From TrEMBL, chains A, B:
Domain of life: Eukaryota
GO MF annotation: an example: hydrolase activity
Binding-site positions, substrate: 198, 224, 245-248
Name under which the protein is recorded: Amidase family protein
Native species: Candida parapsilosis
Length: 551, 551
């Protein structure tokens, strides 16, 4: 690592971004009308990484007004549909790159979701893909650009996960999943922001400033894949890759009203990502796609898994990506863990999705009760930072300040002795086994297991900054390693989502979240998403049920 | 022993220093810019051992201003980090020697902390250590120079503990701890000043003059390891070795705002040092490191103990240096012994450290009351000079004048008959047993012992010259042989540290110290340190708690 003063390093980070932003504008080739509107947009980028600017109230509305038909006709197109145009040559690989580059630039200024553009290598990828049209026409993602979280290695770049001390950590390789996607006709064109330590459900770092929600600029984008949620919520990327060890894929997707899949560990390669606590295996992160488009989520998983990634990454299981043949479904609704109750907008989403499933004949819908959700915090309290956060704190030798959200994640971290880790590994495996028995207790008399559970992603829609003080609605499924797909349902409705009256809080933490929901106007136009949870390796059931819920 | 006139002897002592200063300058190889600025620095070295010069108001800024970045970039780096560079070969052993030699010369002139430079042997050590780089780089202290108190034997040197009469007492061997450290890749490069009789908390002798504080040149460096405290407070040595029989390691470290460990007697080899009263065993001195770097204090202890020094020194215990397994801590706060109250700057430091420990969940904090502190003076008054100071007074046959501070230490000394010593040995052991019961009286209902005590090192920050008239805040732990680690907290603040008002002194000596603190301006920029006290052989618990207090 580095030991220079952090203010100098933040400058170096800003320079890298500004250097890539300059090259991107050249690639995008604005006409004067757009250059004018772009110049006049409210920015979530400040003068320094501690200055958070003055973001728009509805960044997405500003985005749709600012960008021309020449761009939106491509970036607003569903990526699976756009792949048809790229295949039939109604649109060029370079043409698509130019539009999405322009979109990401406008998205970058409005939400601060881009850490580094990749226009040099992206133009080379897109140019040769056009030249090779006849031989690569058949590839399943031919011509499609995509975004990658900054923690994902890309050739010749620093990989820092937001820590300034790692700005000299250059890799000469791509992540396995990136090379696989390139082998299938795609290419990365932008690197998205990630926060300090990665262990916050928001997106603040001293490498980029603060990332904000795509639908309401006063709220967080979520985290840790906050850039990914914002960029793909603005539909300025066809899809992106994030990571999820505590909700870091599903929380951004839910806050920005798009799809995000925490895929089951052992399906797609993620270990070559960079994070804190490298070599820690007690609790493992997973990767997975975020996209505006469910069909795009499904196609990336299918494309990656059909490339047989277990022949490059031996931690992976050779299990085909297969659409389920189920005609009937048994589904549970997780109304609350009875520790922190959901805010009205989430509560209405649960009823909406419940009533829709009941209206289809082939769904049996039951209430799903929690199982010792307090044990999630206790076990993850010992295993997230099992070295007592020594590795993370060493990143602060530059003088880099400790963010308030990071404080929550590392407070109480013990430096575990080997026997302490063994104790909590046994606690971890026992809880997983107990929870499976809980899930199977919902099997019916004929032996039909629960296919999926519908649950909140968070006790609320996109949070106000520095208030993501409860993780269980996402970290529960990291402790269990269950596949979870966040999906859209509705938006805040000011008539329907007034605060609960005569509410009696369940505890101090529940009271905090109740008071956080002061009125729906504080979360105007914020998406209310939910998630589908399945047993391990049932990812595809979740996609199929999400398909039905959106038709 | 010599009986020549002391003025002739002071000449020879100045001559030995002056020749080594010349050779040190020859090794450091100042460019003209530094040589000119060095020449213009206010000197604390006089023309004779009775002329104390005119020291700088703030020696440390003058040190930082005079030296080039080429030197400070090495000497200001934490030594543990610097060890990585020597290991990584980013810097050569001779390069580190050259910088620290230059640093010590500037420190010598500003504070008068060096008795003799060792540039000939240091170049021999550093050169051959680079030549043997491939075979010795694995050693835990490869390439690191260090300072040694003048009382510590080094090959070919006189060992005088500041007494002119011992200038012909030449040793042909190093101290055991030094040979252990050399075998682990380190080497001494400078000998630091020690005062007359070693029994003062200041540093005045007729071998060197007067040594002054690194942060305020009107105040004492402390003693008896005054040179070590000044040199390492100026960060002109990675670490040093001192001795402590009455506070002589913790007082210098506290006065100069660095770390200093009075280690438990049986852990580290010290008996081959030279002092007065050789063969006296009723109260034994100990050694231990002083450094600005806690990690360096810990590593030196770990390095020497892992060399199994009990196989050379049979007084030592084969007790491993072990990081404690404690996850929770119980700590007492010792605000005062109610004989001499601490001045405001020490009192504020106690509040800072209490509240920071209370803010962490894993610390229980209780008040720690004194136990017969008056008996400390009584017993040590008889055992410090149990021959009636006959051995020390004979050093003055040269005519060497008796310093005012030495007068305090030898006034009232009885020449004990065997039965008198037996009586006071029993008094010493009874008090030790009683105090242990007192400490264990703070054990909680669940059986959790007190892990450490927070206490002052002295009734005030760095004292005015000839005012160190109370020892108990350090001596109590020599009577008990408890490990004590001095550690930094804060500096004097003229707004925060005004004299208490309407103060009612507890006794004449408390009044003396109250009037001594006329205003904070008299102690401008003075570090206010505290210390951590532990039971015998719990040294490492103190390191771990000091580690938490700085994070």
């Amino acid at each position: 690592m580095l030991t220079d003063n952090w203010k100098e390093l933040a400058g170096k980070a800003q320079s890298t971004f500004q250097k890539s932003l300059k090259q991107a504008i050249e690639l995008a080739d604005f006409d004067e009308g757009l250059a004018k509107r772009y110049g006049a947009l409210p920015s979530a980028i400040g003068a320094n990484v501690e200055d958070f600017g003055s973001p728009a109230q509805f960044p997405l509305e500003e985005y749709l007004k600012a960008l021309p038909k020449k761009v939106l006709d491509i970036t607003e197109k569903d990526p699976v549909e756009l792949l048809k145009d790229l295949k039939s040559r109604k649109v060029t690989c370079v043409e698509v790159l130019k539009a999405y580059t322009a979109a990401s630039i406008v998205a970058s200024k409005l939400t601060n979701c881009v850490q580094e553009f990749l226009p040099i290598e992206a133009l080379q990828y897109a140019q040769k893909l056009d030249a090779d049209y006849e031989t690569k026409k058949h590839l399943p993602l031919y011509g499609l650009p995509f975004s990658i979280k900054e923690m994902i290695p890309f050739v010749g770049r620093s990989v820092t996960h937001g820590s300034l001390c790692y700005l000299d950590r250059i890799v000469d390789y791509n992540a396995d999943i990136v090379n696989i996607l390139i082998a299938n006709g795609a290419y990365p064109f932008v690197r998205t922001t990630n926060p300090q330590s990665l262990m916050m459900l928001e997106c603040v770092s001293f490498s980029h400033g603060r990332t904000v929600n795509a639908y309401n600029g006063m709220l967080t984008s979520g985290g840790s894949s906050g850039g990914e949620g914002a960029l793909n919520g603005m539909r300025a990327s066809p899809f992106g890759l994030g990571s999820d060890i505590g909700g870091s894929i599903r929380c951004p997707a839910a806050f920005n009203g798009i799809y995000g899949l925490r895929s089951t560990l052992g399906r797609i390669p993620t270990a070559d990502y960079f994070s804190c606590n490298r070599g820690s295996e007690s609790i493992l992160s997973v990767t997975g796609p975020l996209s505006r488009s469910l069909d795009t989520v499904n196609l990336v998983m299918k494309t990656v898994i059909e490339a047989k990634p277990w022949l490059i990454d031996p931690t992976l299981v050779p299990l085909d990506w297969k659409r389920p043949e189920n005609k009937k479904f048994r589904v549970g609704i997780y109304v609350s863990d009875h520790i922190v109750n959901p805010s009205p907008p989430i509560n209405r989403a649960l009823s909406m999705v419940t009533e829709k499933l009941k209206s289809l004949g082939n769904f049996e819908v039951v209430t799903f009760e929690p199982y010792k959700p307090e044990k999630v915090t206790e076990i993850l309290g010992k295993l997230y930072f099992e070295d007592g956060a020594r590795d993370f704190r060493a990143t602060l030798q530059t003088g880099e300040p400790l963010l308030e959200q990071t404080r929550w994640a590392i407070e109480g971290a013990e430096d575990l002795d080997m026997h302490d880790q063994w104790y909590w590994n046994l606690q971890k495996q026992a809880y997983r086994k107990e929870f499976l028995k809980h899930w199977c207790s919902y099997t019916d008399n004929d032996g039909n297991v629960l296919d999926a559970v519908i649950a909140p992603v968070f006790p609320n829609v996109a949070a106000k900054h520095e208030t993501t003080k409860y993780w269980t609605y996402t970290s529960q499924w990291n402790l269990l390693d269950y596949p979870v797909l966040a999906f859209p349902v509705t938006k805040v409705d000011e008539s329907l989502d007034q605060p609960y009256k005569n509410y009696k809080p369940l505890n101090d933490l529940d009271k905090y979240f109740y008071e956080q929901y002061d009125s729906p106007s504080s979360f105007k136009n914020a998406p209310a998403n939910l998630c589908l949870v399945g047993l391990r390796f049932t990812d595809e059931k979740l996609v199929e049920i999400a398909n039905i819920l959106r038709n």
